[PDB]
Amino acid sequence: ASPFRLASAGEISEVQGILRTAGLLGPEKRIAYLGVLDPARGAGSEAEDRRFRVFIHDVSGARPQEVTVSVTNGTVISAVELDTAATGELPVLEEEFEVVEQLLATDERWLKALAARNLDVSKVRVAPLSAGVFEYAEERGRRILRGLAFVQDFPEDSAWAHPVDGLVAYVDVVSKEVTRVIDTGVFPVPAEHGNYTDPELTGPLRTTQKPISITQPEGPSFTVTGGNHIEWEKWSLDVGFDVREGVVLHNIAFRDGDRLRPIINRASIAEMVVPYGDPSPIRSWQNYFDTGEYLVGQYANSLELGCDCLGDITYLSPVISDAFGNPREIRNGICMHEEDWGILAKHSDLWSGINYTRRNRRMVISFFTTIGNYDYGFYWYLYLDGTIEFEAKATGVVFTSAFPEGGSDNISQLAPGLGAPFHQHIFSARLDMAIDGFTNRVEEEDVVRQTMGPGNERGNAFSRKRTVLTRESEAVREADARTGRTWIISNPESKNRLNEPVGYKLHAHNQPTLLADPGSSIARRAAFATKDLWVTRYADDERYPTGDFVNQHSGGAGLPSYIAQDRDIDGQDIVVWHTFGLTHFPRVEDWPIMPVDTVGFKLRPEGFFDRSPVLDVPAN
Amino acid sequence: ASPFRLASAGEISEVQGILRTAGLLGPEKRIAYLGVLDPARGAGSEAEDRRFRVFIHDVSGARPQEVTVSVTNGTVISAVELDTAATGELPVLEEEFEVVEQLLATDERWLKALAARNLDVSKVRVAPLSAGVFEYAEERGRRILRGLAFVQDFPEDSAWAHPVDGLVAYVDVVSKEVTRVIDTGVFPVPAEHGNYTDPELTGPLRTTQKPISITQPEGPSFTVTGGNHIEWEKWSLDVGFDVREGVVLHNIAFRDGDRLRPIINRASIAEMVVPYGDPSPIRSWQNYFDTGEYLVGQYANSLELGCDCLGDITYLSPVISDAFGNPREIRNGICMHEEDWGILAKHSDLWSGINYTRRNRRMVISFFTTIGNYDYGFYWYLYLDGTIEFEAKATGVVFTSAFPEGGSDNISQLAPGLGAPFHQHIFSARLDMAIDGFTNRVEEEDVVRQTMGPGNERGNAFSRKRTVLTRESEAVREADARTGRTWIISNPESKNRLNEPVGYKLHAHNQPTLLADPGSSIARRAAFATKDLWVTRYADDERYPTGDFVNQHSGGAGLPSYIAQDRDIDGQDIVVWHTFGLTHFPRVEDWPIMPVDTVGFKLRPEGFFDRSPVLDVPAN
Numbered sequence A, B: 001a002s003p004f005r006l007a008s009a010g011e012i013s014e015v016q017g018i019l020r021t022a023g024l025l026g027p028e029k030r031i032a033y034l035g036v037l038d039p040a041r042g043a044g045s046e047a048e049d050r051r052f053r054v055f056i057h058d059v060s061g062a063r064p065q066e067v068t069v070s071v072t073n074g075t076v077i078s079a080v081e082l083d084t085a086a087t088g089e090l091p092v093l094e095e096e097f098e099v100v101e102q103l104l105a106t107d108e109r110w111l112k113a114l115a116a117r118n119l120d121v122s123k124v125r126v127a128p129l130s131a132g133v134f135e136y137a138e139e140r141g142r143r144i145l146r147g148l149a150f151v152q153d154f155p156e157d158s159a160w161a162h163p164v165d166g167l168v169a170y171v172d173v174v175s176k177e178v179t180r181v182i183d184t185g186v187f188p189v190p191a192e193h194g195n196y197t198d199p200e201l202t203g204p205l206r207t208t209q210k211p212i213s214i215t216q217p218e219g220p221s222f223t224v225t226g227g228n229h230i231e232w233e234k235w236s237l238d239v240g241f242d243v244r245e246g247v248v249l250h251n252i253a254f255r256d257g258d259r260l261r262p263i264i265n266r267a268s269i270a271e272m273v274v275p276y277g278d279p280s281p282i283r284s285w286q287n288y289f290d291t292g293e294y295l296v297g298q299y300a301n302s303l304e305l306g307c308d309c310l311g312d313i314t315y316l317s318p319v320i321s322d323a324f325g326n327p328r329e330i331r332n333g334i335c336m337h338e339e340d341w342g343i344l345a346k347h348s349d350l351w352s353g354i355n356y357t358r359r360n361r362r363m364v365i366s367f368f369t370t371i372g373n374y375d376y377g378f379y380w381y382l383y384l385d386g387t388i389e390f391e392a393k394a395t396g397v398v399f400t401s402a403f404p405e406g407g408s409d410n411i412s413q414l415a416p417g418l419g420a421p422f423h424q425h426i427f428s429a430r431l432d433m434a435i436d437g438f439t440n441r442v443e444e445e446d447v448v449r450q451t452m453g454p455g456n457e458r459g460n461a462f463s464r465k466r467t468v469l470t471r472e473s474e475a476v477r478e479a480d481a482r483t484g485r486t487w488i489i490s491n492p493e494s495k496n497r498l499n500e501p502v503g504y505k506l507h508a509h510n511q512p513t514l515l516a517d518p519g520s521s522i523a524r525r526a527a528f529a530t531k532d533l534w535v536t537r538y539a540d541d542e543r544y545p546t547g548d549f550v551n552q553h554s555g556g557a558g559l560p561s562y563i564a565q566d567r568d569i570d571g572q573d574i575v576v577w578h579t580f581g582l583t584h585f586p587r588v589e590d591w592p593i594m595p596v597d598t599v600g601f602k603l604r605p606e607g608f609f610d611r612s613p614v615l616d617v618p619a620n
């Protein structure tokens, strides 16, 4: 019944029927993105109109289209031819992954470079990498992928252990044309294998680990209704899924007594970028927007009970469209469970004799995606005390190169002859805020040090200051760990019992932001990543911090174009965009498969409640 | 058999016998600290000499003594009269807590102030607070506590809800003399109660929480031998306990193949300080060194199964001395268990078809202590992948005051009329390092941004630089979150298979350090807290960053005096001291009992191993 319900296979089949009938789904067409649109502001007209947005690619070289469709009214709402030289290319198609290796396999320049290295072309895997926008004028308006080669010694070999350095090719995947092959020199292909299931590398497996059994004999404390509506420990929300963004959280609210109090209207990871810091011409173009270019949701893993998710697990199996409009189920793609989280509150009082201990718990909503060598887990946490936390877990295999003789300032050595270029993994969280409603504002809070003197005779005082961000042009903010800088989202029209505005405080990890030179192509395309915090006024069409068509866009779209409007954000419907990321200098211990590293952020209540909201938690 | 075994009740009884016989334990004497000394460098003489250090107080006003005793040889090794005007007072005695309230109860000035407020003296609790060193010349060489008053409406009432502001007294606990009573004005005593077990405040308890059952059907994966030696998942260590520091970790090592490789020789929280930022004369002197002044280990809680520690718990029950030298068991004072920790490593490979998932786990060693209104949990974590992490969990009841009419820049309002002064909780971790042995060095690692130009034509390159700290005078370091600053402890004489020195990287949280004015008394007494990282050359007598006698010491002892020696630390036996802390602006949600907040640090292997050390972990 809910307008925020997951798309169903039936809805997908209708969209495919509608597109076919209208002549928009010919055998040269491919669906490159399909997703449900969120209800517009003012859904209190309960006239549900389930609408879908579709990007349609044309493998014959015709212009792609953006199409909005109403499943409710069986009609095509709008259909727009796209000039991709202007507004950017469509996302990489899954079927294009193989095409790069196959086209290079018959190219004489490619075969020439492989033969000079005594490599059998049948052993050479080619990674299909997004191209970016650089100096090659012939690429404007064309659908280009770049290829880097790895050797597989046998079909179960890990190809990442055997990079072929000094060699890169550019491919036009529509006209099927290898446009350039660059061979800057021969590097030895690193010889050692990286097969982490080979007993010769693992040694004998441990026998010392004894089982941990986590069970809920009475079932879990949360309920799921309508497919994707969660109620757990006063929290209420809807779990959505989008093929670009992955898990999306809607209508996050907290039942405080009788009132259902909104907190966040929509929470997602709206973009993520991985820039490489190796200046070698073989790799200096390498940056991928896993979310905007590849669509992380469509590579979500099926999560196994007992391995990926442990305990009493409830699964969601989201439905997406394949390239032809058929629905495909991602079986067990979202794991949902509660976890014990230690002590929540504890005190033994000398004067009253009361001994008091309460335990904490958290609700976990997670998925995993795999794009090439990278593997990422996305975790949302809801805690008893009102805290919301996001955590990204990065694992998989690092992207490799040759380690150059005589070393490198921009590459780590992982094994003899084998290197791993320096890089970052940078995320953009989009938080469409709704603290007790839609009239919200953001204050920047800094610790204030005070000088010894009148009024502060012993030199012990310290304070804090808050600065309201009133317009978009002043709402691009940087971290300052040294002054304890945080940001508070409050509702100036909703006060707690002390007559102060209710609020939530955003605590960032204060990791470095984008390191690339501000004049670089990547700094222009990933401008969001150069600052920790942006606040915009809400608008229907401002969904992604990089714009709608990231692949081969020349830059500037998204956040820097939005904030130029300089709209009022002081007590308005606002959106917080938080940049956070990992700077990865690979270590030996990351090889041949990488232990998880993490990054994230959290939001804690700041005078949102009238006292601690967990006074009614019982003893264990 | 191990020299690092916990002190036994029998050893304590011998110490009491030895002291008595020597005339050092008369009925005017009180033991203010008793602890085992660590074996000296060069314990390869296996001539175990179990030695104890004792601080002896004299309630009659005579000079206290420091005494070293050999339980092995039944002899007093040394005994030193202390001039406390010079080297500081002995730690607060537990029996002195009540003495402040009892002495004030008969003082006419005190009774006068209470009667003006219509307070029944029988209802008024007095917190015994350490005094510090300020402007009162008559306090030098005297044992002074300061008292702040709270009202208990009935014996089970939470007194923290009813601070009596505008009133403070100073007390000499040896001569039993109220030296000053200061009454700066009357404030209403806040009326609301803060009784978090009162159904009228909690409302009806939740019935929605269903149980989480954590069990180990085959028992835990770790073994304990010799009372306190742990072996778990290639980790080996000894768990010690000291009445000042609490849980101490000795001989942390990792079994890498056949070799037992040392990592850390001794790890402890060696000091912790809570400075208050309220400039009011009633509280502007308030700072407590919970570790150095009060001794956190002697207030360790007994931890309840299912409430404090959940799962398959192994307990240690450490033995300390009471004020007369009798042994007392802290029943179940240390909890020890392993926890599941999510995904350790995961990859699904497009080219090989291999799907690979492994789960992580961690070994937890924890205790809780309670000093007055504050409650703190200390958690050490050991992970499968070689990571070591410390986490402090802060809870209990916030320290309260009146909220002044017309507001405050240095106090938060928690309830009508009730305030909570701004403060910090700052910890000092002392890491006596032993990365593959005792020849260690520290490098500071900063990210390096590179300019677009020759060699970096696309402006994408970035790098890192490492700076060796060679002498103590250059080994006082500050955080820089903006440049990703970390510190690496390496052994330049031990190389991995890539011929690079083995190392561990320290990742800090980059929270603000001491905020007080550098000319303040607290900045002098807690100088360690003004910088994030100190490195010293190891020395037997350099145990605490504030020195041995913190109570009423005038400042400068500890770290700033140690590093003045300017010793060589480049490939030597070194000690890392890491300052980290929480800056607490109390919120409504912290009242009437505070949800846990956390801070900590972690160390990760940095080319310590020759590849990932968890390749031999099995599938679940």
Ligand SMILES: [NH3+]CCc1ccccc1
Residues within 6 Å of the ligand: A127, A128, A129, A130, A288, A290, A294, A371, A372, A373, A374
């Ligand atoms: N993360 C997307 C880049 C990528 C895509 C496919 C193979 C290897 C790398």
Ligand SMILES: [NH3+]CCc1ccccc1
Residues within 6 Å of the ligand: B127, B128, B129, B130, B288, B290, B294, B371, B372, B373, B374
């Ligand atoms: N943390 C030590 C300060 C303290 C001691 C006893 C009661 C209240 C406060």
Ligand SMILES: [Cu+2]
Residues within 6 Å of the ligand: A394, A398, A423, A424, A425, A584
């Ligand atoms: Cu990485």
Ligand SMILES: [Cu+2]
Residues within 6 Å of the ligand: B394, B398, B423, B424, B425, B584
């Ligand atoms: Cu605090």
Ligand code: NA
Residues within 6 Å of the ligand: A265, A432, A433, A434, A438, A538, A572, A573, A574, A575
């Ligand atoms: Na909003």
Ligand code: NA
Residues within 6 Å of the ligand: B265, B432, B433, B434, B438, B538, B572, B573, B574, B575
């Ligand atoms: Na050392």
